[PDB]
Design a protein around this ligand. Sequence first.
Ligand code: GM5
Ligand code: GM5
Ligand code: GM5
Ligand code: GM5
Ligand code: K
Ligand code: K
Ligand code: K
Ligand code: K
Ligand code: K
Ligand code: K
Ligand code: K
Ligand code: K
Ligand code: ZN
Ligand code: ZN
Ligand code: ZN
Ligand code: ZN
Lengths: 419, 400, 416, 401
Amino acid sequence: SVGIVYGDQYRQLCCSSPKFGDRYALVMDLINAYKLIPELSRVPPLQWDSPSRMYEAVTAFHSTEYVDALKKLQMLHCEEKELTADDELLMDSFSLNYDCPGFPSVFDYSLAAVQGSLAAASALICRHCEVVINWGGGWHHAKRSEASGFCYLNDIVLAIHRLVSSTQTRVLYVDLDLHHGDGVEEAFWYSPRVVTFSVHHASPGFFPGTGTWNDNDKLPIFLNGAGRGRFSAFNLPLEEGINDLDWSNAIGPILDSLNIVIQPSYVVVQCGADCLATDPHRIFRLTNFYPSLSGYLYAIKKILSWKVPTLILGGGGYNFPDTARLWTRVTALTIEEVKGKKMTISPEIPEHSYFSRYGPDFELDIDYFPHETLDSIQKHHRRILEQLRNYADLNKLIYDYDQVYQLYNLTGMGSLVPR
Amino acid sequence: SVGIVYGDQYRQLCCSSPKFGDRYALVMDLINAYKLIPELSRVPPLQWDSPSRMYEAVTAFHSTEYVDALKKLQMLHCEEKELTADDELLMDSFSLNYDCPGFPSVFDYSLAAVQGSLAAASALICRHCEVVINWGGGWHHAKRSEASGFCYLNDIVLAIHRLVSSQTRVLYVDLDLHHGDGVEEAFWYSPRVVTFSVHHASPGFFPGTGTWNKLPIFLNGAGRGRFSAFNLPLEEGINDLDWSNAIGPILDSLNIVIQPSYVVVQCGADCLATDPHRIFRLTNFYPSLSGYLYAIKKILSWKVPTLILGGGGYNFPDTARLWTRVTALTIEEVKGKKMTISPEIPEHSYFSRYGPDFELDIDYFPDSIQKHHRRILEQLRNYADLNKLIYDYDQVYQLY
Amino acid sequence: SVGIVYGDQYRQLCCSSPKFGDRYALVMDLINAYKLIPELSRVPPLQWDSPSRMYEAVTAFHSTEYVDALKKLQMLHCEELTADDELLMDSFSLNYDCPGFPSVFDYSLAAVQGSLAAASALICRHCEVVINWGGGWHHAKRSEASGFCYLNDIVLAIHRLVSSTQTRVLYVDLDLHHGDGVEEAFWYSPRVVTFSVHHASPGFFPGTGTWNMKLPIFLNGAGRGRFSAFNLPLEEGINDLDWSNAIGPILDSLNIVIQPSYVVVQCGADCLATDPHRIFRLTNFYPSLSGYLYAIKKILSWKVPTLILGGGGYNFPDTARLWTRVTALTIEEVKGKKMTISPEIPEHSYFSRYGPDFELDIDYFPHEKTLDSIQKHHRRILEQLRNYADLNKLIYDYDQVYQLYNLTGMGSLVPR
Amino acid sequence: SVGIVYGDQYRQLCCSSPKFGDRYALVMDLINAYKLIPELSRVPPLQWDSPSRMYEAVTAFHSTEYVDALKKLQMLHCEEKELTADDELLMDSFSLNYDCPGFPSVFDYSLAAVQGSLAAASALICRHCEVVINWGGGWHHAKRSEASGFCYLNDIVLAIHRLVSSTQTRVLYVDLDLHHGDGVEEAFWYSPRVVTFSVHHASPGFFPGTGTWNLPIFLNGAGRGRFSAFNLPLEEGINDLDWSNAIGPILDSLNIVIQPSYVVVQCGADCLATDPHRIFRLTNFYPSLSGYLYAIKKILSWKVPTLILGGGGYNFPDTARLWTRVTALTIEEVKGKKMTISPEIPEHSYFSRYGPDFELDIDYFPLDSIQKHHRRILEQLRNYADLNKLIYDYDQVYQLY
Ligand SMILES: O=C(NO)c1cccc(-c2cn(CSc3ccccc3)nn2)c1
Ligand SMILES: O=C(NO)c1cccc(-c2cn(CSc3ccccc3)nn2)c1
Ligand SMILES: O=C(NO)c1cccc(-c2cn(CSc3ccccc3)nn2)c1
Ligand SMILES: O=C(NO)c1cccc(-c2cn(CSc3ccccc3)nn2)c1
Ligand SMILES: [K+]
Ligand SMILES: [K+]
Ligand SMILES: [K+]
Ligand SMILES: [K+]
Ligand SMILES: [K+]
Ligand SMILES: [K+]
Ligand SMILES: [K+]
Ligand SMILES: [K+]
Ligand SMILES: [Zn+2]
Ligand SMILES: [Zn+2]
Ligand SMILES: [Zn+2]
Ligand SMILES: [Zn+2]
């Protein structure tokens, strides 16, 4: 069973923010227009039996004072009067400003993603679904008491906490967004049982600034967790311009090696679409092509081949029609891999009420033409495999050198694997 | 609303240089130890959506080749190998040497101050704050294609450029011991940015400008910027009261005549009597009254949106002592809210650096100007004539 | 007497082309709004007593087959072309930047009418200077339209001047572009000395007026006209002061050696810093002094009868701002009568075109060298002037040219 | 109309290089001697309103650093002194050496061909002309940042780029030169909307080395451009008839399947039997029918707006003889007006260069491999149409062979 989170009120709330507009509606209606919905189990967003129960769920990660302020922010925007000087100071102390402003539905909107991702986690735990998709979740930047990067509540952290607390259990978090998954990495910085791995662009002044090299008389180093969590936070920063094949070859062996050594009970994937070549960021050059294979589809197919219960989340993606094109192909691929059932998608966009948003071509492939020794990252592979070996030793896990070696030897790079 | 620039990454980068060490941490922790943080709105440093957007922002003033060299200098210092002869020549061509050497974070460090001061300007433009403080910025010596005086990127120029491009005039006031040459040069041809620096000048003293230039005279701008660059050089040894009487009437007449839309103040603390320069004898005393606090209170009385920046200051505990009082004064004047600072340094992480006395007061025992006033008043009349500005000449004469 | 060409029908025709729109109207109405018109003598455009007399006048330079085709082009646009018609027009470059429109012949002829009348007013001594802001079309060739120019009013005016009763004419071309049509017309003629200052670079219109690439050389005329065509190409970015210092000594030297009976000045405004070409950085400032006003003031100080023409200029309000100052300066220098121009644009029906500032100075902020000098061009040009004087058996007053250049310590550049 | 690029400055620049001498003047003076100029619309070379505009046009393909170096090379060759060691190294890094040395007009000469072919493309886009000829263009070997084979700037790539960006638009490029058209092929390697087709000699060690087997296989494009680059390499000694039958069905198949909006033809004359290469044996005969005239007549029969360019040709009078007949044929096919050309060269300034016989015909007395290439090319065209979701009659196309 492949699950997908949706509902009537859920759709309205996910489409109520000023930044993401109707993106969620385009995504779900394109999935529906390609007749995928009858193949999927609807997973209803979680609801609670009291305000105290909802508050207890959200403050499993976020501070009480931060949740109080976010609810007040919504109350204030639902009325006419402006904020007092002391209300402004309170909101500024939680970064509820700039890129994370208030709007009349800001609390309900943020809470909805939490409701959907917690429901998704519960459907994996009780083995009702082998995979669950939530295209309304994936907000990786929010911190315990701080909004960041259009993210107000961290549905990912709360979903992972539910998985890891169910009954040895380890979770592997994989972050494919253009940006570093800083909020999820920070929440589990001291926790060996949640291993985080983000691949992303990093460069001076590019948001959020972390996930890359860190005094004046020593070579830079990668921080990678602390305390009991030492060696448990992984990062691969990449330069701008990377294409499908080079991104696939960059993360593929690393993903396979993480699965071999960590042996996770659950995988959580953030699948932000802002690495597409047609995203207005224009930083990476990934596609949604499916023969010349989309880096995204290569990575998802590899993750699903492990047969580990998996949560697939959304995230960034600022070309709304092209984000829908990618996530529709991810959804079809998940059905095929899990159910063994061929899913044939017409190259022409089907009739539906958002059809006119797919112009001028009205085709499923994004409108991009890919075009092309010293840009390699073999020293990153070596650094990351040494970190994985250190993680295994610290946590008294089997490090199967022979299997990791043969994996890397498939591409002639077995010498990078440490013993 | 009074804003202040800080953040966790910002703090680590502002403390990553060899010359300034952990100064920014002492400053912000003393402000926090005196319970001033809850009175202030945190302004997060600006971040960009692509490398191209960052480059476009910095090269609004600096040349692309200089920005390229500064980034390569950081990369080269993150590897063990020595520089090649060709790379040494490249860095020399941009003065990335001597007092502006490379180190492993030199580009991220320099850019951080630009991110802070651009966010500060935007907070003023959108009216979120009436005043914004950035003690990580104020690097007034860097030029279009040249590092100078421990300054690599000119965050002040970029901030002012954002302000004027939002009829808009900016008044720039430079209180540092040293002449603010980079900012003056950037706006040498611009009448809408009036610059005014007070500083020590004497033969061989850095950077050499801001003073008399067959016979000698004062240069003061060019083209349509003629008469728009003001300077007051002072002899060594000046105390709070004489420095205050020197600058006070000039500040008041500049505001009256120019009517600025924004004021930008560089508040470098190397004029303190206890700075190792030991050139001027200013204090942080708040009843003699600190020359710094006199100037800031006067500027804030104008009720013009204002950016307050850092700069020099090489006695790090006494720089923190001064800038903590400047921050409290700004809260008082803008919000109308009394601030009571204990004369004893409160216990906190850096308490031991304030020994052996642990007081907030620094440990100190406290016709040339008339001519400069006549010259500056004449220059201001010439500036107003050239720019068709309305001003009661006998109202501004009586200030002096 | 300072004359200026205008009239009611003339204004309509000069404002009838697709490229230049109402520019001539803005120029003359700004001159009128500053109250300069009562100081000037109106010079009416020349009219003829028959079609044959008009045709004879135009074909003093242009070919009969080119004039015939230009007349037919207007006729056709007053009524599609046949394939033979299209071939005919293409053979004369009556296409691309020089297309047809319903008034193309009358429009082109009008500039000729104005500049011929201007020349006659100088010849009979009615005016000491005449201004024609509807003329100055320096690119047109004897059988070819070029660069928005269909008929060469400058060539026809110079021909009238030089054939009036040892007469030599000095032509000075200040336009951004090389004055190739005028230079070509008089290539074999020693009695018309042409001097153009301009931008030149690879691919920039029209391509001539620079090195011909043995090291490259400047071509400078041929036959009896050898050494009589002068050129100074300049790199982009030059400001008022550097342009003034570039051409000032060369102009003074040309006057000393040539001793012209008439000067003709093309004053195209596309060197302004605010022209959309954005190549040179000249201004109209008058205190840091406009290069144009510096050069006009110098030329008028010679006290030689002078024709001042327009030409390029694609920021129409800023072209009017410059040419209004040129007009006031000409009155001041010739009459000795102070002309005070208010910095605020006066009320008139084109007032709204001068926003958002509504001031007379162009809206530009000048800003800022050792290697960009052109002293070898000065040396080359003075050698050419010496060669011209020797070929034509004219006095070469070395002492005077030397003292001129030694005012800036550059007397060593002058050849013996 | 039929347009042709010329002008006095254009003529001077096109005649300023050491390799091609006054070839362009012979071509245009023979066309004029046969009284063809009144039948043709003159297309003036493009000029720009600033250096920045020129640079923007040229760097639509070429790198800024390469254009900077080519301009510097001209500057350096306009002075007396030798190059410094540092400047020699700079020029070497762009292959501005060997067969692409500097000379006093090298940048203005190279830019002139770009000016002409861009103006030719604009005349087709605005529909002033149905066909435009530029015998000063056709420099197919230059790359983004590399000079090659006497080519410094690629006027063909820049012209094709203007054509494809004008409105969906598809361009068919046909390269008849003795050499493989590698620079144009490479520029559009990833682009399905520009289909390139070169017929050429290829053999071990022969310039430039590409356009042939790479069990070896033909590379044919990449990405969305897979199957969009076509090549036909031919053995030395081939005659008019065998070359015509080799390419004739390929050309018709491409037009039927691609349905191009524009055709661009490179017509380098170094396949002539009398070219000093002496590799192929084509003629300019118009009764044995010139392979060049066969191909041009076929392409013009499609009634698609067409650009005809020059290229190689190192026997200058015989190149003029061929291109004069190409020009007369273009007028005939487009206008439907017969062009009678005397078999004897007319009197004109260059008459003495056509001795000792002074005739218009060049002075020349005139298998399983090709069938294998045809099967391969047909399979590639089927793959191209499938990948690009184009509809075509499989047997109507195969019938052509
Ligand atoms: O995706 C994110 N985090 O994972 C995230 C976090 C912070 C900021 C942004 C964001 C989005 N946009 C608008 S798209 C656009 C981008 C560049 C140019 C023009 C439009 N700008 N910044 C996204
Ligand atoms: O602040 C500045 N510009 O605004 C600036 C610019 C250039 C140089 C310096 C500087 C600082 N120090 C160390 S303090 C010290 C001073 C005197 C004796 C012993 C130590 N030495 N030179 C500061
Ligand atoms: O003045 C001339 N000869 O003396 C002359 C001759 C040929 C062409 C042109 C001309 C004018 N414009 C439009 S202005 C403009 C220029 C650059 C960018 C944007 C607008 N474009 N080309 C002027
Ligand atoms: O045409 C070309 N590319 O399309 C091209 C490209 C590279 C080189 C050459 C070239 C020309 N010549 C001299 S002719 C000759 C040929 C053989 C023997 C004697 C003289 N030699 N090589 C032409
Ligand atoms: K990521
Ligand atoms: K962890
Ligand atoms: K100062
Ligand atoms: K200034
Ligand atoms: K000129
Ligand atoms: K002459
Ligand atoms: K070929
Ligand atoms: K192709
Ligand atoms: Zn993102
Ligand atoms: Zn200082
Ligand atoms: Zn012009
Ligand atoms: Zn060839």
